[PDB]
């Protein structure tokens, strides 16, 4: 319950998992101070203890500081309270006592959304699948908005994809700690993060989806961007994109946070487009 680093972390019966049952695998995500690794967790579903399931395992090597563990413990404790949703990297279990810390979270087979879209390019990927991707993140963000979480940056890299193409958001639970293009004006300059600063980032995320995993603000040094944003100039409507759907991106990129749309509206707007196709 919001506890810091200790010699041995406290036992929590609602979330604890047997480390002898968990079997680690090859490294999924290279990381500097902490890392995420693949693992075949046996008996993850306790109703069927014989059958196994593939899972991700966030952890840290012998080098991360005392503060770096407290971040991972804070990331764990936030995931407990937020609970389950279809479009979120949910917590499955934790291994704390009598050994190193392993936080078990559900695995994503097809990787991040940027690498997913860039792979499936025409030298697959239809229009409704792109709208289905944009709709699922909006639903996922709406749930995290209602639980008072507030996402840090939000981008194609941070959203992950399942075997059956379900968009699941990751790193929502991580505390504060490069992504200049994705940040809102108030988040860049004054550093005041709100629900409406993620709305800006969702606008940038919509751009990434309908450019098939393109890099936003193409061909600038991350300096004229600042002057460009505060002179009434935003990104253009990309190749193959409707004007009403582009209108939602322009709504997100309004300078006034009050003028930007809430996540409830962006779901309901995309719902009408998803219901059409
Ligand atoms: C060599 N190529 C490296 C990139 N390839 C890849 C493919 C699927 C992947 N899933 C995750 C992953 C996370 N990064 C993750 C996280 F960062 C936090 C919480 C849960 C997570 N679950 C994941 O499943 N990484 C992947 C990498 C393909 C092979």
Write structural notes for this entry.
- Helix 5 (195-210) runs antiparallel to helix 7 (243-252).
- It is built from 8 helices and 7 strands.
- The chain has a 5-stranded antiparallel beta sheet with strand order 1-2-3-5-4, covered by helices on one side. A two-stranded antiparallel sheet has the order 6-7.
- The chain is globular.
- With 277 residues, the chain is an alpha+beta fold.
- It has 2 domains: 1-107, Phosphorylase Kinase, domain 1 (2-Layer Sandwich); 108-275, Transferase(Phosphotransferase), domain 1.
- Strand 6 (159-161) and strand 7 (167-169) form a beta hairpin.
- Residues 28-29, 36, 56, 89, 105, 107-108, 111, 160, 170 line the site of ligand 38O.
- GO terms for molecular function: ATP binding; fibroblast growth factor binding; fibroblast growth factor receptor activity; heparin binding.
- Belongs to the protein kinase superfamily. Tyr protein kinase family. Fibroblast growth factor receptor subfamily.
- ATP binds at residues 28-36, 58.
Could you give the distance between the termini?
A: 45 Å
CATH class of the largest domain: Mainly Alpha
Q: Shape from CA axes?
A: globular
Q: What structural class do the secondary elements suggest?
A: alpha+beta
CATH architecture of the largest domain: Orthogonal Bundle
Q: How do the strands line up in the largest sheet?
A: 1-2-3-5-4
The tally of domains stands at: 2
Give the DSSP E fraction (strand runs of 2 or more residues). 5-15%
């Amino acid at each position: 319950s919001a506890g810091l680093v200790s010699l041995d972390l406290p036992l929590d019966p609602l979330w604890e998992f047997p480390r002898d049952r968990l079997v680690l695998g090859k490294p999924l995500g290279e990381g500097c101070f902490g890392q995420v690794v693949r693992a075949e967790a046996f008996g993850m579903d306790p109703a069927r203890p014989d059958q196994a399931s593939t899972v991700a395992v966030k952890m840290l090597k012998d080098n991360a500081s005392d503060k770096d563990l407290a971040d991972l413990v804070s990331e764990m404790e936030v995931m407990k309270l937020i609970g389950r949703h279809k479009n979120i990297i949910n917590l499955l279990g934790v291994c704390t006592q009598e050994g190193p810390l392993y936080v078990i979270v559900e695995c994503a087979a097809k990787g991040n959304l940027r690498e997913f879209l860039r792979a499936r390019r025409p030298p697959p990927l239809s229009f409704p699948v792109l709208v289905s991707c944009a709709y699922q993140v909006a639903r996922g963000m709406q749930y995290l908005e209602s639980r008072k979480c507030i996402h840090r940056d939000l981008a194609a890299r941070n959203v992950l994809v399942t075997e059956d193409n379900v968009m699941k958001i990751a790193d929502f639970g991580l505390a504060r700690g490069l992504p200049v293009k994705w940040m809102a004006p108030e988040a860049l300059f004054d550093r005041v993060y709100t629900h409406q600063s993620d709305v800006w980032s969702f606008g940038i995320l919509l751009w990434e989806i309908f450019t098939l995993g393109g890099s936003p603000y193409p061909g600038i040094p991350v300096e004229e961007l600042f002057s460009l944003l505060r002179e009434g100039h935003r990104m253009d409507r990309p190749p193959h994109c409707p004007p009403e759907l582009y209108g939602l991106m322009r709504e997100c990129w309004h300078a006034a946070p009050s003028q930007r749309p809430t996540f409830k509206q962006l779901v309901e707007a995309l719902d009408k487009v998803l219901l059409a196709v």
